[PDB]
Design a protein around this ligand. Structure first.
Ligand code: EK9
Length: 331
């Protein structure tokens, strides 16, 4: 048959994986649904072409290393990895994963969620995050498009490219734009708010406008909220702004559950030190119906990269990518 093509990208995944269809995109790749003739199921195939940039190579290696060690119901896994037999011919890497039904970005673009489903989705994000954080790892890019859903409404966290050992502007914590595990909680806060109204709570266009949108609902920050190593330009901008009143949560979300708004308030806290932790959020009365610490596992040990991935050249990272994927080759 030969190599399959989808929206301009060539996928050399045959003869095992055939009849490919478009399901997503990334900065240096494409996601496709394909038929696996061995397991007789449709699977997801993520093609990545990162070898022209050092940043894309480390983002690829970080994800592959994290997803292979992690084993959790609310985190996407790796079933198989395809690449050329030699390093000289390895221009692409194909990550084979479980095919999902939809993602939260698509679901919030077409459907209105009931409180029970908002509560069940939030629980699963935090259940998965509890495992990520227990491993001393930060996702750093939590957003509706990185939250995958199946037919039975089971959630799975994907895209561990930007993950680091303890991004999209709209779900970015204020402290990142001023100067930790709390940055993921802020993102979950933004996701919860988007589930309640089917729209982004803070749709900023640039870093200071993103802060302006946050201050537009939270109001002007206190002295303690600004007691950190702030960027001079950002500090001088915040001090030059007129007083902003705090928009109450029940006013912004009129028909939302009062318990959901209390947890939302604790997640969308300007000061990261006063922000609720993942285990504290799971214990909140809003998620009482699903809260079960006996069925909320943690990682066996903390995760650590033996090498300084940031300092390694593009060629050295390719060698490590080639070595990490060697286990999936026949022999
Ligand atoms: C593994 C998987 C399985 N099924 C589906 C899926 C199925 C049906 C409808 C929507 C998505 N998505 C995924 C999935 C979606 N995004 C990603 C995913 O890894 N996306 C990132 C960018 O966020 C990426 C990064 C670099 C190159 C390409 C892609 C995986």
């Amino acid at each position: 048959a030969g190599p399959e093509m989808v929206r301009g990208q060539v996928f050399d995944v045959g003869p095992r994986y055939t009849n490919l269809s478009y399901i997503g995109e990334g900065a240096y790749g494409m996601v496709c649904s394909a038929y696996d003739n061995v397991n007789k199921v449709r699977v997801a195939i993520k093609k990545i072409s990162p070898f022209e940039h050092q940043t894309y190579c480390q983002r690829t290696l970080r994800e592959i290393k994290i997803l292979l060690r992690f084993r959790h119901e609310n985190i996407i896994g790796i079933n198989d990895i395809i690449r050329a037999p030699t390093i000289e011919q390895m221009k692409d890497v194909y990550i084979v994963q479980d095919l999902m039904e939809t993602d939260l970005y698509k679901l919030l673009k077409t459907q209105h969620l009931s409180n029970d489903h908002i509560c069940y989705f939030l629980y699963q994000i935090l259940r998965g995050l509890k495992y990520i954080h227990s491993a001393n790892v930060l996702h750093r890019d939590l957003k509706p498009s990185n939250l995958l859903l199946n037919t039975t409404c089971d959630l799975k966290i994907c895209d561990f490219g930007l993950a680091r050992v303890a991004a999209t502007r709209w779900y970015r914590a204020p402290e990142i734009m001023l100067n930790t595990k709390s940055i993921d909680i802020w993102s979950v806060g933004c996701i919860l708010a988007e589930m309640l109204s089917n729209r982004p709570i803070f749709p900023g266009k640039h870093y200071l406008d993103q802060l302006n949108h946050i201050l537009g609902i939270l109001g002007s920050p206190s002295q303690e909220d600004l007691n950190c190593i702030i960027n001079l330009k950002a500090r001088n901008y915040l001090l030059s702004l007129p007083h902003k009143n705090k928009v109450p949560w029940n006013r912004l979300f009129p028909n939302a559950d009062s318990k959901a708004l209390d947890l939302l308030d604790k997640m969308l806290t300007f000061n990261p030190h006063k922000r609720i932790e993942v285990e504290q959020a799971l214990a909140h009365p809003y998620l009482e119906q699903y809260y079960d610490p006996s069925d909320e596992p943690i990682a066996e040990a903390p995760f650590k990269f033996d090498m300084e991935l940031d300092d390694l050249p593009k060629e050295k990272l390719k060698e490590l990518i080639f070595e990490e994927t060697a286990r999936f080759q026949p022999g």
